[PDB]
Every structure is written in structure tokens, then in C-alpha cells.
Amino acid sequence: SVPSQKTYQGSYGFRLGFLHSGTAKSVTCTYSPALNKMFCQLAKTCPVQLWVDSTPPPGTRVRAMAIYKQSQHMTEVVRRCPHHERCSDSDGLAPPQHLIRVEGNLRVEYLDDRNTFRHSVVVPYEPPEVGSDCTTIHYNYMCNSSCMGGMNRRPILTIITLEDSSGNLLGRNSFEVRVCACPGRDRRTEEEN
Amino acid sequence: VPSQKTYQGSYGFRLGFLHSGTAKSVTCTYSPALNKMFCQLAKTCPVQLWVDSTPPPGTRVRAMAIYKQSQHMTEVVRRCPHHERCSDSDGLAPPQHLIRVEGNLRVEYLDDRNTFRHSVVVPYEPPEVGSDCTTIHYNYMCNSSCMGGMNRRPILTIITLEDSSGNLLGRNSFEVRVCACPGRDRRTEEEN
Amino acid sequence: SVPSQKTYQGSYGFRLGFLHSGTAKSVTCTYSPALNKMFCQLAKTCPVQLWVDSTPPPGTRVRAMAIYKQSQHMTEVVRRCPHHERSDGLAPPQHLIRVEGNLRVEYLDDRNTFRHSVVVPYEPPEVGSDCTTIHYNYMCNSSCMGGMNRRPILTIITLEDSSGNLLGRNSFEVRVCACPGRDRRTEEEN
Amino acid sequence: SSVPSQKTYQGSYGFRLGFLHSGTAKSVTCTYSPALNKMFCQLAKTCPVQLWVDSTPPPGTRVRAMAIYKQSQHMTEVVRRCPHHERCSDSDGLAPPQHLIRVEGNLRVEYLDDRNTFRHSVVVPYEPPEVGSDCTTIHYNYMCNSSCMGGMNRRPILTIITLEDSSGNLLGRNSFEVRVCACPGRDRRTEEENL
Ligand SMILES: C#Cc1cccc(/N=C2/NC(=O)/C(=C/C(=O)O)S2)c1
Ligand SMILES: [Zn+2]
Ligand SMILES: [Zn+2]
Ligand SMILES: [Zn+2]
Ligand SMILES: [Zn+2]
Q1: Where chain B is broken, by preceding residue (C–N > 2.5 Å)?
Q2: Domains along chain C with CATH numbers
Q3: B82, A166: Cβ pair inside 8 Å?
Q4: Residues near C157 by Cβ (< 8 Å), separated by ≥ 6?
Q5: Using CA atoms, how far apart are residues A153 and A180, in angstroms rounded to an integer?
Q6: Ligand 1 mean position to C58 CA, how many Å?
């Protein structure tokens, strides 16, 4: 029973935003609005903005989970390849198997689901900082889309769910992700289609 | 399904609403064209009671929500799990109840023993010196959009006037949308 | 305290136009350019034309509001008499000015001034036509005891953006009477 | 200074801008004054800008548009939409709501909030002229009026069109003044009668 990817703004008007970073040679993470697709480098900072019409209560949580986009691969759990799992890159909080990490958050929590065996990373919701109208989470993707014995060129979605302290669903959104050496070049190439 | 049929009855019982318009700042606004209240979560929703003649002593006013659509009508309207557990409690209303009355310490809440439907009842008070109607302040404690609650399904509120024994004196109804921007949503919905 | 009646064509060159109806016995509404005054019958169609040099943006709105013309009555809210206050399903019973034939009409009791107004979306002229026509109804006679009671009123037509920011304003005096043709002719002979 | 350069540069490919000879008739939604080097256009309406080159730039060449204030005392201020227009819904799903300059009819359009200057710009791939045609046309939309309180607020702006290679190296730059107004025909005629 593949986890739901259906968009749901729900009670708090929950949407995702991304920086308008462009496709310049130097860019480590870039979002294509035309493709609803993030292009990012391995282990590099991937800002995802949370936008709400109304402030969820304290103890609201934000979960990230990867699934395969293709229907024939969707029941397979998205995990790191053997090679990246054994690279000495653990930050002491993230399980070595987990594709998606959060950086800069000491309250981050990781789940190996007892029944689905799917991986996810959860942080407390904090309201926007002074200056901002959105909340930024810094994701790291710890395997390349190309990795043999991992994703192996199969496209993935990230599903961002907003939940209350009791685990009740408040909101859900999703975006395609490609983890690659040259996000700028790969975004430009994929858009020319 | 409880009756929604309009009935002015013996005392000429009608509902009135503030003529608030659709300015960005408006927290609650009524569309006469749609017979539909647009209001924000937990915010004051004035409903006016108009009578041609003063109902008898011990007259009561009940509010009850039903789903508007025929395929959802037998389902009891309640809060979503999330809002049921949230600290938005006045100490009087059951946590499950969508419709509260604010500013009335004589308010009474019912879980109907047989229908399991929720309702909130207040004593009828005649208009204040100067005024021609009685205002009740309703709060809707879930958004129309709430996942695992109304979940975008439209609802009606039914306002019934009853005597002290619970005999029907009068009934009216209006559609409700609980939303972030009532002004914008009323304007948008009227454009159709 | 009192809403502004100062004419303002503003950015879009906003002016009012009226049908050149004359003063024949049969006429239900007639405008005097010499007096800038509409003479109309109770509840009858009052065409008001909106003329613009440039098309205002989508979500532009048109508000109508009545005030008393005389300085000693200007702070009093214009409303219907008790009798007429006692059919259309949309307009509050107290409101003097209604719009007919528009399902998108919106009515306001101002929270702070207690002044009444009616607002419709601006629609551009049809291709070929030069103006937009709104059909107003006045729901009380100028003569009504316990209402306007023979006091003259102005209608103020404001053009506003979707946020309620003023784009344009015009005004015209209104007399609601049994015989607009006769009353216009009589008032002009002065 | 901080301010991005507005200096004209035809550079290696002989890069210059052209505009339609549209005139000042009542109906005209965008009109260019050669005497003033100034585009007069209506909000959200199609603004053709022609790219002329002496020699075809390589594939992966890009064309960026950016607005700056013309006056030296306002030049370090970022040109953006007013609060009012930023919140208006008419959005194409691609352009940030804050961006004054959009490109229409181009699904390969890319928008930049510069991480360090905070300046906005819109980029499209350079395509050579079609069989028959002698120049490349881009369709710009300006999403705020020159008059807008809490935006440009009657301050004149320049649009800077830069030609860059795939690596972001500058190939060419040109500029033109822009007025976004209700009546471009009338406003061009009025502004030209001054001299
Ligand atoms: C033609 C045209 C066009 C396109 C986009 C924006 C615009 N100005 C606007 N001004 C407003 O206040 C409205 C707000 C809203 O988008 O509803 S849109 C005009
Ligand atoms: Zn790997
Ligand atoms: Zn809820
Ligand atoms: Zn009257
Ligand atoms: Zn603006």
C-alpha cells in the first residue's frame, strides 16, 4: 500500500516554495517550476520553503519521504546504494541507509517504519524567521540518481507532509528530485524538452 | 436526516446577517444570493434572530450542522481529529462539536442519544433596548478544507426555535464555508 | 463624518453619462445637464453610464452611495422611511439605492460610518459601445415623511480597485418623484 | 559601484535591439520612441523586443532582462512589483510574484533572485531567426504601472538586455527606458512634444 502522494493544502493552506536560484555553473540546488523538479548535488544544502496561510500550533511536525515515481517501481523502498551506505559520512543522527537528511537541526528524528520499511526524516515546524514569510528546511540527498545498486537512474518524488503532534495529517505536497553532479546543466537540458 | 424545511411559524421567525461586504479585513460575510455565510476558524459569526412577536418564556435556540450533499447527509458533522485534540477550548463545548456559542454562560451542548448528531442550545433573549433583533455569536471550530473532517464538503447550519418542552416553533437554515479569506471566497463564488 | 463628493476623473478618465430622454409625460427617468440632477420614479430603472478613456484593471468595482446635499443634514445617513423599509432578496430593506439585473451586486453597512452603499464589478463596454450602463433603483420618494422628507440628496459613484483604493469619483443630484418630466421642466424654468 | 552595468556593448556578434514601428494609435498596447529610446507599454500586455546580430551566437547562448532605476539617487534600489500587484492572482505558474519583467509564450523561461544583489531577472535561450525573419523576437510583460504607489512610484526605469554564453560570460548589452501606463500612444505623443 504505497504511501499517498496526492496534494492537500488542508486547514493551514500548506504549499512548498523554492528559491529562484537559476541554472548558473556554480548552483548546488535549483528548482524547475515547469517540471516541478528539484536538481541538487550529493550531500549539498537543498532549501525547501514551507508556506502556510495560518500558523500551525507548536508541536506540528514536517516529514520528508522518498518514493519511486514510476508505477512499476513504486512498492520498492528508496534507500542509499551499498557504496554510499559504507562512506564514513554519517553525521551521528541519520541512519546510514537514509537517502534524505536534514542539516542544521539538532531536533531531527529519523524513522524506519515498522510495517512499510519506508524511511522518513521529521523536524518540528517553526514559524518564519524575522524577514521571511516562509519556513526553510535544509535537506541533503545522500545518493546520486545515477547510483548503480540504488536509485539507478529511476526518478523519485519527495513527499513533504505536515502533521500535528498526534500524527494527524494536516497537509501534503510533492516534487520530483534528481541528485546529479551538474544541477544547472541538467535542469537546462531537461527543460529544452 | 433532520428537517431543513424553512418555517417562520407563529412568531414570524427569520434570520438576519450583518451587511459586511467582501473587504480583505472582513472575518465573517453573508451572501444573500447563495444564502451562504463565509467565516474564519474560531472567529465570531453573528446570526440575528428576527421575530414579529416575542416567543413564550423558556423558548430555546438550537444550532446543528448537516452535510449539504445527499450522499454525505447521513454522516454526523464533527471536528477533524487534529482540531478535536487542539487547545481551542472554552471549558463548555465538547471537543468534537463543530458549532460553539461564545459569550453565553447558559449555553448547553447535546450529543443526541439516538441520531448521535451534535447541537448547541441557548435561551432565547428578546432584543436589547434600541435593537429589533437578537444576535447569537457562533464559532465554527474546523475549516471546510480540514483533512479528516468536513474535507471540502459543504455544510448547512439549521437554526430551530423551540419551546421549553422542545416543541418546534420556527426553523431556518444557511450554507457555511469556514475559510482563511471569507471576503475573497465570497467574491469568487458570486462571480459564478 | 462625511464622505468626499469631490469630482475626480483620475487615471482612467472616469465620467458619468445619462440618456437624453427629454421631459415627455411618459418618461420614468430624465437627467438635467443644467442642474446635474436625475429626476426618476420610485423603484423604476435609472440607467447611469460609466465612461473611461482607458479600461480599468480586472477586479475594479463601482460603488453608489447617497448623502444629503445640504450642509446641516450631511452627517445624517440616507435611508428609507419606516413604511418603505417594511422583495428583491439581495438588498437590505433600509438601503435607498439598489442595482437591478446584476446577480454579483454586494451591499455594505459600513462598520464605522453606518453609511449604506451598493457595489457591482466593473464590466468594460461591449466591442462597438463607448460606455458601461448600471441600472439603479431608488426605493424611497424625495417626499417620504420620516425618510428623506423633501431634503435633496446626491448619489456619489466611486470607481475602486479590488482592494477598495479610489480610482475615480463623480456625483449627481437625485429627485425621486411621481412626475420626473414635469418636475425637471418646472425646476429648469427657474 | 554595486549597481549592474548599463553601458552599451554590441561586442563580438554585433548585438543590437530593434522594436516594431507600431505608431501611437488609440488601440496600441506597446509603442517604442526612437527619439527617447523609450518603450511605452500597458501592464501585462505583449512587449516585442527584437534581437539583431551580425553573426549567430553559439547554441546555449542566453538572453537576460533586468530592470534598474534610471536616476542615480535610486539606482541601488531593487526594482520590484508593489505589494498590491504581487498579491494579484493572474500568475502563469513560472514567474515569481515579485518580478516586474516576465517572458510570455516560452516554457524554457528561467527566473533569478540573485543571492547577493537581490536583483530580479528573467532568462530565455537565444534562438536564431526563423526561415524568412531577420531578427529574434522576445515577448516581455511588465507587471506593475510606473505610477504604482509602493513600487516604482513614478520613478523612471531602464530595461537592460544582456546576451550571455552558456557559462554566463557577457557577449553583448543594450538598454531602453520603459514607462508602463494606461495609454502608451497618448503618453508617447505627450513626451515627444517636449522638444
Ligand atoms: C490585463 C491584465 C492584467 C493582468 C495582470 C494583472 C493586472 N492588474 C491587476 N490589478 C489588480 O488589482 C488585479 C488583481 C487580480 O489579479 O485579481 S490584476 C492586469
Ligand atoms: Zn549511492
Ligand atoms: Zn479541523
Ligand atoms: Zn419612503
Ligand atoms: Zn503595482
Answers
A1: none
A2: 1-190 (2.60.40.720)
A3: yes
A4: C16, C48, C50, C62, C63, C64, C169, C170, C171
A5: 10
A6: 5
Q: Which three cell numbers stand for residue B17?
A: 446577517
Q: For residue C125, what is the DSSP state?
A: P
Return contacts of D148-156, CB within 8 angstroms, 24+ apart: D148/D81, D148/D82, D148/D84, D148/D85, D149/D82, D150/D82, D150/D83, D150/D84, D151/D80, D151/D81, D151/D82, D151/D85, D152/D69, D152/D79, D152/D82, D152/D100, D152/D180, D155/D69, D155/D70, D155/D71, D155/D74, D156/D69, D156/D70, D156/D71
A110: nearest Cα among A97, A95, A88: A95
Measured CB to CB, residues of chain A less than 8 Å from chain B are 8-11, 13, 53-54, 57, 164, 166, 168-171
Nearest ligand for residue C165 CA: 1
Q: Select the residue of B21, B24, B191 nearest C104 (Cβ to Cβ).
A: B191
CA B82 to chain C, closest CA, distance in angstroms equals 34
DSSP, residue by residue, D104-163: -S-TT-EEEE-TTT--EEEEEE--PPPTT-SSEEEEEEE-S-TT-TTTTTT--EEEEEEE
Going from the Cα of D85 to the center of ligand 5, the distance in angstroms, rounded, reads 5
Distance CA B181, CA B185 (A): 6
Q: Which residues line ligand 1 at a C-beta cut-off of 6 Å?
A: C 57-59, 161-162; D 43-44, 88-90
* AA letter at D150: G
| Run of H or E residues at A184 | helix A183-191
C115: nearest CA in chain B? B19
Among C161, C163, C165, residue to substitute to test ligand 1 (most atoms within 8 Å of Cβ): C161
Question: Which atom of ligand 1 approaches the CA of D44 most closely?
Answer: 4
**C-alpha pair distances (Å), A121 with each of A41, A112, A139, A158, B7:** 19, 9, 9, 11, 56
As for chain A, the residues directly before each break of C–N over 2.5 Å are: none
For Cα atoms C156, C159, C163, give the angle at the middle one, nearest 5 degrees. 120
User: DSSP character for C54?
Assistant: S
Burial code (b: 16+ CB inside 10 Å, e: under 16) for D133-169 equals eebbbbbbbbbbbbebeebbeeeebbbbbbbbebebe
| CA count, 13 A, side-chain hemisphere, C102 | 21
| CA A40 / ligand 3 centre spacing (Å) | 36
Instruction: Please list the residues that pair with C37 across neighbouring strands.
Output: C32, C173
Search chain A and give the residue with CA nearest B179. A11
Nearest-CA distance from B80 to chain A in Å?
A: 9
How far is Cα C138 from Cα C95, in angstroms, rounded to an integer? 9
Looking at residue C57, the DSSP 8-state letter turns out to be P
**CB within 8 Å: B19 and C90:** no
Looking at the CA of A99, name the nearest ligand.
Answer: 2
Solving technique: X-ray
Nine-digit cell string for B28: 465573517
Strand pairing class (A119-124; A109-112)? antiparallel
Residue type for position A64? A
Chain A residue at shortest CA distance from B143: A11
Nearest to D44 by CA among D3, D5, D99: D99
Q: Is D144 annotated as a binding residue?
A: yes
- Beta carbons within 10 angstroms of residue A122's beta carbon: 18
Cell of B138: 457562533
Please tell me the distance from the alpha carbon of residue D23 to that of residue B42, in angstroms, as a whole number.
57
Interval between CA A172 and ligand 2 midpoint (Å): 27
Whose cell is 418618461? That residue is C27
For residue C166, give how far its alpha carbon lies from the nearest alpha carbon of chain B (Å).
14
Instruction: Name the residue among D96, D147, D148 with its Cα closest to residue D123.
Output: D96
C-alpha Rg value of chain C to the nearest Å: 16
